[PDB]
Design a protein around this ligand. Structure first.
Ligand SMILES: [Mg+2]
Lengths: 118, 132, 108, 86, 86, 101, 192, 122
């Protein structure tokens, strides 16, 4: 007789969640969002906030230049496809006066353009 | 004479690091490799574009971190996390440092389509291994 | 509609918290899709529309038999064996090759 | 305060802490309370457990540290917390 | 013999290669349709980087001021002096 | 914005050969099968002889991936001799040592 | 700059808490004056705070035995146990006859496309198939190029279809149709 | 700790053998000690093996224009270390594989895993 067990199934997340439960918080270390260099430590809460807002500033820096120039990045190399690494196109690709273009600029959140072509 | 990657002795007043000081025949006897990617072993396919992206990365980080990189980077590559680990100096302000880290983080993640992580390491002055 | 997706995104913003650990960085990268799926089978995605082993190598159904004693049918057997032994091409480009030969042979 | 902190440590209420300003106010007043009516050994234990891992303390929190240490008459800890403040 | 020939034919029909006896000069057509041609290989059509995304992206980033490349600095200064005197 | 006109000519070769690969594949299988009649192969001879002389994989020269040099290229990184020597001597290339056996 | 957590850090401190992830060296985080380098003639190995060689070391400072012990205290949930299939190879062959090769090749970069990783090949034992006499004669006469004599192992190869699961399907399909055509008696068997 | 024991009996992996290829014997045997201790506290059976190293040697010219008689020779050291697992579960297999591929080393590592799921004939 073989007591062959049925395979219990998980997602991609539970192993790393158990790993974090192994690594509870470090009572002597700074939050991981900041770096680990003593020169790059925030000393005060205001300095930490300035560091964080500078980092979010750089994030939307790359977001702005990427969405301004989507041609330089259309080549995907990663598989499977990552739509949140694909460019977000903010210009209306539908130019004729149509309801498809109406839904298009409604999705693109262009209020004056939607009103004008309505 | 051989001068592939050997810095020549000027007069005894020339600051130089370990990597620039050591010759290419000490490349795995004393130095190690500045980029760790898996393309160069027995069975692999994509090592050519690994190399072209390696030189792209070196020139790009040098162009976008102007005059603050002490010596050459460490370009590590495991799975799909790229690691640019840096030895950056302590001259420019940390707001600029975090700004360029986020800028580079996002653009290289976006250009190579993976998790790309830059880990800075701040050094006061460019370190001297010997004076030649 | 947009009210429920707005409620979803505002719920996301008010449950957005600092990363505070590299394991949580890996968590968010798995959630977005940046990190690879693991354990990896070298065949993540790439379903090939559920071809399931007969459309790749058994090409009678797209062969559409002519008089089988002919050299044209012999060429069909040869190209059918070749397209069966292709692993890099799928059934759709196999049958468009087959239809290209059908079209050209009907042209002649 | 301890019972709310225990409810915090249950599960993802640390995620329910929320933003950085709310977290700073949270831990600042919590540690002010700890310095106000706890004994000095567990105030120092909470000091090393929370600062600077959880938050960056304020100047009012600093003068309350000094008041707590003066009440406890443990003036030997003054140089260490001084170096920490600097 | 004849039996061995028809066992080879039966194995060919069973496994998927060509059933009827055919010479190497069309068995080669079967290999041609079994492998990819010289032009369709991934390294063949991706041997070169396109260089246009690369160079024009560095161009755009430099004239946005996010990139500082000393080679282009050299050509700018040298052509400034060359238009000054030439 | 390519290295030279020779490199740009080569990438023209690569791109449009990769486009015009399938028809050439069908008709050169029609060359070197020995079943069809000879004139029925001669009309096919006409079609490939009319197919353009820039997509045939006979013009594909494996030049160096950084700097155009026809002869002296290692395929495994598409690098020329002295560029590969430069890089694997500065030590930015993992696993390449100096062969001393 | 600031005085670091290297000397702020004190003994009996949890190191899985210190280093969760595989990270590069970070000497300020490292509480260890680790020295690299070929020393100069009248000097010492180069110090810790700035070494690119310390950085280039693959850095197995995220994994020590007590950390892996605690990691698999967490990871011990994700496992069953085996039946009494025994360490005996003949016993597990009796219980489960067929054997199949179905692999993966782990690369590291942008993409995980190693096409050869779809290779699948099936090995089965005639002595475990137990139902072949002139069928086993017909079987060998079909598959001549395999079936080495010294061990009764039948090895059928598939690398013809792009996906691993349909390669497994080709393996099992070839096994069952070779079995059925072996048991299908043909009319010209007698004139051997 | 979500678990979700779902429906179907085990895939019955016998001999999951991991060939670890590297440029660096120190990385290979540190990873060996790591995997051996992890397997020991897991309870699965681990065996060690050292396939012989392969050295890819090749030759280039040294000067740019002339002097073929003075050549440079470069080499690659590809060392192999085998960690074969016998008698490990499918769930234990993919959790152990998941752990060791999270903590797989960098460019000095490949993890070629050979899985022999057993099954019944049909
Ligand atoms: Mg010489």
């Amino acid at each position: 007789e073989v007591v062959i067990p049925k395979k219990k199934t998980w997602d991609k997340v539970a192993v790393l969640q158990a790993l974090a439960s192994t690594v509870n918080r470090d009572t002597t270390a700074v939050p991981y969002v900041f770096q680990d260099d003593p020169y790059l430590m925030p000393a005060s809460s205001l300095e930490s906030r300035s560091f964080l807002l500078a980092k979010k500033s750089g994030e939307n820096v790359a977001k702005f230049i990427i969405n301004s120039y989507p041609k330089y990045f259309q080549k995907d190399i990663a598989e499977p496809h990552i739509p949140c690494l694909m460019p977000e196109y903010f210009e209306p690709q539908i130019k004729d006066i149509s309801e498809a273009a109406l839904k298009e600029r409604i999705e693109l959140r262009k209020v004056k353009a939607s009103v004008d072509m309505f | 004479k051989n001068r592939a990657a050997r810095v020549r002795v000027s007069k005894g007043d020339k600051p130089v690091t370990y990597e620039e000081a050591h010759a290419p025949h000490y490349i795995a006897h004393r130095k190690g490799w500045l980029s760790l990617h898996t393309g160069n072993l027995d069975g692999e396919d994509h090592a050519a574009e690994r190399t072209v992206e390696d030189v792209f990365l070196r020139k790009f980080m040098w162009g976008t971190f102007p005059g603050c990189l002490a010596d050459q980077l460490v370009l590590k590559r495991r799975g799909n996390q790229l690691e640019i680990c840096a030895v950056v100096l302590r001259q420019l302000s940390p707001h600029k440092y975090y700004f360029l880290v986020g800028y580079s983080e996002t653009l290289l993640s976006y250009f190579y389509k993976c998790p790309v992580r830059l880990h800075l390491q701040t050094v006061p002055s460019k370190v001297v291994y010997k004076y030649l | 509609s947009l009210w429920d997706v707005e409620f979803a995104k505002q719920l996301a913003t008010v449950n957005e918290q600092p990363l505070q650990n590299g394991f949580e960085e890996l968590i968010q990268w798995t959630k977005e899709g940046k990190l690879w799926e693991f354990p990896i089978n070298n065949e993540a995605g790439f379903d090939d529309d559920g071809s399931e082993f007969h459309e790749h190598i058994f090409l009678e159904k797209h062969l559409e038999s002519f008089p089988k004693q002919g050299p044209i049918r012999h060429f069909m057997e040869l190209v059918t064996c070749g397209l069966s032994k292709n692993p890099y091409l799928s059934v759709k480009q196999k049958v468009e090759h087959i239809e290209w030969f059908r079209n050209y042979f009907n042209e002649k | 305060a301890y019972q709310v902190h225990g409810l915090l440590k249950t599960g993802d209420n640390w995620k329910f802490i929320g933003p950085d300003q709310h977290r700073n106010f949270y831990y600042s007043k919590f540690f002010d309370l700890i310095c106000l009516m706890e004994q000095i050994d567990v105030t120092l234990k909470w000091y090393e457990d929370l600062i600077p891992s959880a938050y960056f303390p304020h100047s009012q929190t600093m003068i309350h540290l000094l008041q707590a240490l003066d009440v406890a008459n443990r003036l030997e800890v003054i140089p260490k917390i001084w170096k920490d403040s600097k | 013999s004849e039996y061995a020939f028809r066992m080879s034919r039966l194995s060919a029909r069973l496994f998927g290669e060509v059933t009827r006896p055919t010479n190497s000069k069309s068995m080669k057509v079967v290999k041609l349709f079994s492998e990819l041609p010289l032009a369709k290989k991934k390294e063949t059509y991706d041997w070169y980087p396109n260089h246009h995304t690369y160079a024009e992206l560095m161009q755009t980033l430099r004239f946005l001021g996010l990139y500082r490349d000393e080679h282009q600095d050299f050509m700018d200064e040298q052509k400034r002096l060359k238009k000054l005197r030439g | 914005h390519y290295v030279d006109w020779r490199m740009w000519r080569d990438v023209k070769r690569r791109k449009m050969a990769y486009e015009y690969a399938d028809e050439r594949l069908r008709i050169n299988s029609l060359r070197k099968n020995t079943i069809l009649p000879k004139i029925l192969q001669d009309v096919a001879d006409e079609e490939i002889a009319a197919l353009p002389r820039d997509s045939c994989p006979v013009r594909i020269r494996n030049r160096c991936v950084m700097t155009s040099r026809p002869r002296g290229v290692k395929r495994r990184w598409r690098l020329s001799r002295i560029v590969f020597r430069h890089l694997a001597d500065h030590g930015q290339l993992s696993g390449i040592q100096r062969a001393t056996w | 700059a600031l005085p670091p957590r290297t000397e702020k850090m004190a003994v009996d401190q949890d190191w899985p808490s210190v280093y969760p992830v595989a990270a590069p060296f970070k000497p300020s985080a490292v509480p260890l004056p680790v020295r690299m380098g070929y020393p100069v003639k009248k000097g010492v190995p180069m110090a810790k705070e700035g070494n690119l060689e310390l950085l280039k070391i693959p850095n197995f400072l995220h994994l020590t035995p007590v950390a892996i012990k605690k990691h698999c205290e967490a990871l011990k949930d994700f496992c069953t146990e085996w039946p009494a299939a025994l360490d005996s190879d003949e016993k597990c062959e009796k219980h489960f006859p067929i054997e199949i090769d179905s692999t993966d090749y782990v690369s590291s970069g942008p993409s995980v496309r190693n096409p050869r990783a779809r290779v699948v090949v099936l090995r089965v034992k005639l002595s475990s198939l137990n139902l072949d006499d002139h069928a086993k004669k017909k079987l060998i006469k079909l598959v001549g190029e395999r079936y080495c004599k010294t061990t009764d192992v039948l090895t059928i190869k598939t690398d013809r279809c792009p996906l691993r699961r349909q390669n497994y399907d080709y393996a099992v399909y070839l096994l069952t149709v070779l079995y059925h055509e072996s048991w299908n008696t043909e009319e010209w068997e007698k004139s051997k | 700790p979500v678990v979700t024991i779902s429906d179907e009996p085990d895939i019955l992996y016998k001999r999951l053998s991991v060939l670890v290829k590297g440029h660096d014997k120190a990385v290979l045997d540190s990873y060996e000690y790591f995997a051996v201790l992890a397997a020991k506290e897991l309870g699965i059976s681990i065996k060690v093996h050292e396939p012989p190293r392969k050295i890819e040697r090749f030759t280039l010219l040294q000067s740019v224009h002339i002097y073929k008689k003075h050549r440079v020779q470069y080499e690659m050291r590809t060392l192999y270390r085998c960690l074969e697992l016998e008698h490990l579960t499918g769930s234990t297999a993919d959790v152990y594989l998941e752990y060791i591929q999270r903590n797989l080393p960098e460019g000095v590592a490949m993890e070629v895993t050979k899985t022999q799921l057993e099954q019944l004939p049909e």
